[PDB]
Amino acid sequence: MAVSVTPIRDTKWLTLEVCREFQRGTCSRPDTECKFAHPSKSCQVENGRVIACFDSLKGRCSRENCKYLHPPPHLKTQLEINGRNNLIQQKN
Ligand SMILES: [Zn+2]
Ligand SMILES: [Zn+2]
Incomplete structure (x- = not known):
């Protein structure tokens, strides 16, 4: 589905x-x-890292046991800039 139904690959x-x-x-x-x-x-954590809540950032999260990091003010600046470095290019 990574290249045909779900772009969040x-x-x-x-x-x-x-x-x-x-x-x-x-x-x-x-x-x-x-x-x-x-x-x-x-x-949830993997190899010494944690995935930030894409649902909270995009405006979809409503969980009470969310497995993803709701981004704090001190790291939203980093996440914004990390996203801007890739959102500028897409093919599928
Ligand atoms: Zn969340
Ligand atoms: Zn610390």
Whole structure:
């Protein structure tokens, strides 16, 4: 479906890294101010990274156990600019 029914074939700009100090509960900033992402409980992680909620960014999310990182003000600036670096080109 990646090239015929669903164009959301990847998350290259949304797959934000996790905070290293938060992995041992020794970080010094909240999720709203840190340099990396801070998963809650239901948030799914892969290879030391977490996917930001595309549904929350596009205006579709309504979950209570969302597996994706709702983007904080300190990282929305990074996600905007990461998205702008790829949204400028498409073929399918
Ligand atoms: Zn942190
Ligand atoms: Zn969400």
